[PDB]
Design a protein around this nucleic acid. Structure first.
Lengths: 99, 87, 109, 100, 100, 84, 98, 55, 87, 100
DNA sequence: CTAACCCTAACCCTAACCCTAACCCTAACCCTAACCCTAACCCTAACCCTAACCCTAACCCTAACCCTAACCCTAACCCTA
DNA sequence: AGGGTTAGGGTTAGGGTTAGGGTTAGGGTTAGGGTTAGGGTTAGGGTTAGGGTTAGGGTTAGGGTTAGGGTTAGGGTTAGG
């Protein structure tokens, strides 16, 4: 509401931008948006927990790109994990080249 | 006023055509006669477990209203993640 | 002496909140220290997964003579994609039916 | 195909094809709303169920029932049969690991 | 000319009882080590496993095989049969959710 | 020297028969051994792949019983005794 | 060079003490001790993980006795959960009194 | 000074390391703050479970 | 309209000193603390077994009221004939 | 300061004698009425009991409880004990033929 | 610094009445599946024993784990846009 | 500010090696009993219907309930011994 209330968090803008990028002149529904948000949150929590468990098993205290890549390779299957790893490495290289 | 409460005319609430339509949606051609009672019992046990989990969550949250968020949390704790309703 | 404030999404090329991912990793009680490339990696993986799922949903909607994405089309695309079905095996999509799969024995003579 | 008598087993196939292409709820809300309130009475009284909790409960129950019916139908054709029986639901639930 | 040959059944039953009243292993260790080495060769070369690791692997594999055989025997008993079948194994893996 | 084709045959027939007798099987069919060997090979492949991933993440070249137990627990099979 | 080998933590002395308290005539092998060590660690990690999830769901950055009592009632079944809750309440009452 | 150093196990009446449980709860990245009665509750529950299993 | 307490006396009334007064009638000096629950349970099952027969007797004459005559008639079948109240 | 505290035993004995030398009731009437009403609710709804009926029920229940307590005290005395125990109650119900 | 305290704003849950209309209950007819009996085959139960082979008992040593010593960069907390 | 990185040596340890004999499997053999093929019996629900219990909104009000904000104090934190 608007009476000194609190604002939640979501990813509707990012999901809509990704949809417009992968397919123009299409649409989406509120139920589909909520399902996508729940799926993103579930995958995020699962990968974060896997990275934390790997860091605790490795007797370390920092979760880095290596831990995230290992969690992705352990969670995602085969070709999906390979493509995700390639995209993550490309993003890391772009971040290193320009920040 | 409302001088009545709920009874056991609740297991019978899951009507026979409803179970028949559910079996037809799943992929069952012929449904036996003794299937409705077992289905009602299994559904009652599952609902009892989920409602007990939701009541425990509500008592831990210091509240008196069961919410869809608590229902989704209990369903995910069992091993059934549901999407759409909530987030 | 701030010159300009460039956004992390623009400097990374992705369309995901790297700042929100880093804040969630820092406040989620996952680890005392949170790396710099880990949020970017997670955001890229999530963006790729979302793009694949949205492409599958759009293809299903275009095949079903529809313009908007519905949970039925989402469930259809998830059950059609073998990798997506293996990844989300214990996930039930609300307001969505199964595929009309009829066995050979159930077919009429 | 006279409107007086149809061959048994043919109307069920059309019903299965028609019901497998819709996402509407099969169990009704009002009979299901009282079942949720009656169960919660043994745990703690004076409880107020939200309007979105019963919907998710009904959706999860319908999904579980559809899965159990599909498993029972898969177990039925194994014994050279075509119909389900109560002796098959027990085995289908025991193999899954629920009854233990 | 009577070695008193046992009818097919009693020997199987007493062997089942003898193998159930024991805690020793059944599969050998060196062939299992060669098998896991050949499997690990398809991923990373020059790998060195562990004795406790391969022992735990053999124990978990034996437990999983025992559970699968129990499920298959239960399916066969439900199917008015006493012997296991590949179709029964396939149905057990389909119901348990291992098919993928 | 190790025949990669002489490893599926390593799971001998009397071993599978004794395992089925320990589980509770009276009569074992002939086509059960091949399917059992295939399922065991797939399961061992998955577990060994998980252990190799864990060892590569740990910057090591030796697979340990701790990593094996961790992979088994990640798949949903917690094993006791061997480790801690 | 130096000695200074790492020390592995275990609950072998506490399990043996409980054994002597319950049955002061029986023994526990090394395999049974390792099994009990893995069982205690698994239950402790499951309860601590459930309490952390409850502390993350409700906007509160603390873990009190209520979070553990709720995690016990949610993990343990029926009579075991009630007995554990009663034992914990008796323990915290003896602590708050003595 | 300091008089005497009594053990937490003796003051609690249990036979489980309450100090080790508290240290594991503090270093396990579970929460930024760890209560006082929570380790005692967990130790009592674990002790009861171990006693039942050993019996 | 309706009582907010829907517990309907969940095996209550059988308090600790109430049991500590019936046991002393027989000759019990030291009454164990783990006896109240078992006493409540046996009282509940006995009352259930008697009320079942009472309802079965009252439902025969198409009557919706339970009288003392039906109660003593049901008690006679169990093997405990009571004098005075019935008659 | 002094109150001449009674040693554990004399108070119990005099209370036993006082309760044995009386004919009044011990359990209350309204809680018993609520209990029998709750029990009758599980069979037929909208039931009206009787005052004499619930009085006879309370009298029979008190007599049965007195007999059970006497049997338990006799079993405890035979077992070289003075207090009752749930095992003694179980053995009394097993010998009397009430089972569970 | 965060959780136990209090006033209190607004929301959301419940209570209750209507209007039929999609849906539910039974009983009316009948087709084909579940099930018992039985008989024909061929599949695996039961040896089996000589050859495969494995684990028992040790030696080693050289690739690998990591321990503790030095050093700095990455991560966090601060403020404020 | 200290966790992670690097170079360095110790130090456990697993792979590689020997041989052998005692345990056990491999491929061929006799034959029992279970399996799926068949046809006969029975009643089990499938399908239609029309009498009619009851459900989805449509549109109200009231007062329980979550908690927004503010105050404050004490339990977890950090540190060394």
């Amino acid at each position: 509401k608007k009476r000194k209330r609190s604002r939640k968090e979501s990813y509707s803008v990012y999901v809509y931008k990704v949809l417009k990028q992968v397919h123009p002149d299409t649409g989406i529904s509120s139920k589909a948006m909520g399902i996508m948000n729940s799926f993103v949150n579930d995958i995020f929590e699962r990968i974060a927990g896997e990275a934390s468990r790997l860091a605790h098993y490795n007797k370390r205290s920092t979760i880095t790109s290596r831990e995230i890549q290992t969690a992705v390779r352990l969670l995602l299957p085969g070709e999906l994990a390979k493509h995700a790893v390639s995209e993550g490495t490309k993003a890391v290289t772009k971040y290193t080249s320009a920040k | 006023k409302r001088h009545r409460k709920v009874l056991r005319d609740n297991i019978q609430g899951i009507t026979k055509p409803a179970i028949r339509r559910l079996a037809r949606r799943g992929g069952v051609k012929r449904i036996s006669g003794l299937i409705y009672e077992e289905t009602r019992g299994v559904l009652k046990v599952f609902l009892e477990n989920v409602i007990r989990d939701a009541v425990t969550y509500t008592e831990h949250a210091k509240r008196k209203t069961v919410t869809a968020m608590d229902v989704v949390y209990a369903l995910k704790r069992q091993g059934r993640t549901l999407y759409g309703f909530g987030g | 002496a701030r010159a300009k404030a460039k956004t992390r999404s623009s400097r990374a090329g992705l369309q995901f909140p790297v700042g929100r991912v880093h804040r969630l990793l820092r406040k989620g009680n996952y680890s005392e220290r949170v790396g710099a490339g880990a949020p970017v990696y997670l955001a890229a993986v999530l963006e790729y997964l979302t793009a694949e799922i949205l492409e599958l949903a759009g293809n299903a909607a275009r095949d079903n003579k529809k313009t908007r994405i519905i949970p039925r089309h989402l469930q259809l695309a998830i059950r059609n994609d073998e990798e997506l079905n293996k990844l989300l095996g214990r996930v039930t999509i609300a307001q969505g039916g199964v595929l009309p799969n009829i066995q050979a024995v159930l077919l009429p003579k | 195909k006279k409107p007086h008598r149809y061959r048994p087993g043919t109307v069920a196939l059309r019903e299965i094809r028609r019901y497998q292409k819709s996402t509407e709820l099969l169990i009704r809300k009002l009979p299901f709303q009282r079942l949720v309130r009656e169960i919660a009475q043994d745990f703690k009284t004076d409880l107020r169920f939200q309007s979105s909790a019963v919907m998710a409960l009904q959706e999860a129950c319908e999904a579980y029932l559809v899965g159990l019916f599909e498993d029972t139908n898969l177990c039925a054709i194994h014994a050279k049969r075509v119909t389900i029986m109560p002796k098959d639901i027990q085995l289908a639930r025991r193999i899954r690991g629920e009854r233990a």
